[PDB]
Design an enzyme around this catalytic site. Structure first.
Site, mmCIF file in Angstrom:
data_model
loop_
_atom_site.group_PDB
_atom_site.id
_atom_site.type_symbol
_atom_site.label_atom_id
_atom_site.label_comp_id
_atom_site.label_asym_id
_atom_site.label_seq_id
_atom_site.Cartn_x
_atom_site.Cartn_y
_atom_site.Cartn_z
ATOM 1 N N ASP A 1 44.889 14.852 27.710
ATOM 2 C CA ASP A 1 44.033 14.697 26.794
ATOM 3 C C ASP A 1 43.242 13.388 26.360
ATOM 4 O O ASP A 1 41.710 13.045 26.736
ATOM 5 C CB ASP A 1 44.943 14.377 25.705
ATOM 6 C CG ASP A 1 46.234 13.465 25.893
ATOM 7 O OD1 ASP A 1 46.029 12.726 27.271
ATOM 8 O OD2 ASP A 1 47.035 12.559 24.876
ATOM 9 N N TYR B 1 49.949 31.082 31.610
ATOM 10 C CA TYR B 1 48.780 32.168 31.223
ATOM 11 C C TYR B 1 49.606 33.926 32.573
ATOM 12 O O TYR B 1 48.636 34.985 32.102
ATOM 13 C CB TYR B 1 47.754 31.873 32.762
ATOM 14 C CG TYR B 1 46.428 31.941 31.786
ATOM 15 C CD1 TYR B 1 45.000 32.632 31.276
ATOM 16 C CD2 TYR B 1 46.200 30.575 30.774
ATOM 17 C CE1 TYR B 1 44.314 32.206 31.027
ATOM 18 C CE2 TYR B 1 45.908 30.094 30.214
ATOM 19 C CZ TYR B 1 44.876 31.334 30.056
ATOM 20 O OH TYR B 1 43.451 30.745 29.666
#
Ligand code: EE1
Ligand code: CL
Length: 419
Positions: free
Chosen positions: A286, A163
């Site tokens: 995940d 970011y």
């Protein structure tokens, strides 16, 4: 004494200040800066203000009243200040001075255009905690059979990771310069296609990880939560996401006296206020997206990086009704900008269609931050009563049995009615 260019300080009202002991001193007539927001901001921010005003009037009578002070970002800023003035300095000046603020969503273009103003606000103000509670309200439609088992609080690192906005576009001189440095000076052999190649950079640091994980563990202490889970993709990204995990475990050992739990790698310490054991563990990202669905009961406080927290916030919100009932806060100690999880949903903008619940519950968080617990409790009461009456916006209406559709403003009306 100095006035602003376009901001108007309310004629009645006083600033919140940080007390000498670092708590907040909140006047009974506090000034609260707010940003309306792009897109559906116009649909959800005005009802939020009415709902807050109604809760404050009912809880306190004439004695307390918020003096709302508009400040500008996004499209409305370019309207008020002129072209390209997407985030005027005085907007940031005012949000810092008045300490506690709330914003609607702001639009970030895809693939080009301005860098996110939401990130820009977070980084300028160094609001390094993005705090997102995931709570199921009884009667909300859920895709999941047992949504009440989902009860989590996300601590999303808010100042670094990919970011940071560090990237260069394919075929530009700058991207070619970076790729030449990578291949020729750093000996990087693993770029499969170095021509016509965009390049982004992901920084993750010891100081950034430390302050985020420390806040998450302290939250678990202060709220009697039993688990803090570090979520990371540290097998593939060893020196960023993997280092986040290692630095996070070090925070538990260094600042809370944690020790290895049952041989490690999990850690444990005893809540210093209750003596109950808190476990710090970790899950690969995940795998985590499955675990929150199949075993939500095993998770409580989540501590994770900027990108992971963004994804996880929406995945978890979906279990309890969607990002129409998903509040949040951007925090640095006592300074805070409250903010819904959702974006500007431009395909619905101005239709008075979307759920104002997320931004309203962000205001509920704001009121608790201010110590105005009685008014915050009425917002929850109104929310529960409106859901129980099944007078809901379109996102809930389509999943509920025998419900009545209301507009964004209509849902605020229903909340006020049930206070
Ligand atoms: N300002 C902010 O902080 C954000 C603004 N961005 C912008 O928003 C535009 C559009 O993005 P988008 O992908 O369309 O997402 P959004 O959330 O707006 O809408 C998707 C679907 O969610 C459902 N939905 C949303 N809202 C409601 C609601 N109120 N009621 C009921 N349903 C709702 C609906 O679902 P449906 O009923 O249609 O199936 C909808 O369509 C882009 O410019 C982004 O940059 C999005 C996220 C954050 C930022 C990112 C940033 O910095 O730019 C972020 O990453 C984070 O910190 O979290
Ligand atoms: Cl205006």
């Amino acid at each position: 004494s100095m006035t602003y260019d376009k901001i108007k300080v309310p004629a009645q009202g006083e600033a919140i200040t940080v007390a000498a002991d670092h708590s907040l001193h909140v006047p009974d007539n506090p000034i609260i800066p707010f940003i309306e927001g792009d897109g559906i901001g116009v649909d959800v921010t005005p009802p939020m203000i009415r709902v807050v005003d109604a809760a404050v009037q009912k809880a306190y009578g004439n004695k307390r009243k918020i003096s709302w002070m508009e400040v500008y970002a996004g499209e409305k800023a370019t309207k008020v200040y002129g072209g390209d003035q997407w985030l005027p300095k005085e907007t940031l000046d005012a949000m810092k001075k008045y300490v506690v603020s709330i914003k609607g969503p702001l639009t970030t273009p895809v693939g080009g255009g301005i860098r996110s103003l939401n990130v820009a606000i977070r980084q300028d103000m160094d609001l390094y905690v993005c705090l997102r509670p995931i709570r199921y309200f009884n009667g909300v439609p859920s895709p999941v059979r047992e949504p009440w088992k989902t009860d989590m609080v996300i601590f999303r690192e808010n100042s670094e990771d990919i970011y940071a906005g560090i990237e260069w576009q394919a075929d530009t001189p700058e991207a070619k310069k970076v790729i030449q440095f990578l291949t020729k000076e750093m000996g990087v052999k693993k770029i499969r296609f170095p021509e016509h190649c965009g390049i982004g950079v992901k920084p993750v640091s010891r100081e950034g990880t430390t302050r985020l994980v420390k806040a998450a563990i302290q939250y678990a202490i202060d709220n009697d939560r039993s688990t803090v889970t570090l979520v990371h993709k540290g097998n593939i990204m060893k020196f960023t996401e993997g280092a986040f995990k290692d630095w996070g475990y070090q925070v538990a050992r260094d600042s809370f006296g944690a020790k290895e739990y049952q041989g490690g790698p999990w850690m444990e310490f005893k809540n210093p206020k209750t003596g109950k054991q808190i476990i710090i563990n970790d899950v690969i990202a995940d795998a985590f997206l499955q675990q929150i669905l199949l075993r939500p009961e095993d998770y409580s406080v989540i501590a994770t990086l900027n990108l992971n927290g963004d994804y996880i916030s929406d995945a978890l919100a979906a279990q309890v009704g969607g990002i129409g009932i998903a509040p949040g806060a951007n925090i640095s100690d006592q300074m805070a900008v409250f903010e819904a999880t959702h974006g500007t949903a431009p395909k619905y903008a101005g239709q008075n269609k979307v759920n104002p619940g997320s931004i309203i519950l962000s205001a509920e968080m704001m009121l608790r931050h201010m110590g105005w617990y009685e008014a915050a409790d009425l917002i929850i009461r109104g929310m529960e009563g409106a859901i129980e009456a099944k007078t809901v916006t379109y996102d809930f209406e389509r999943g509920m049995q025998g419900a009545t559709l209301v507009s964004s403003s209509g849902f605020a009306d229903a909340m006020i009615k049930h206070m």
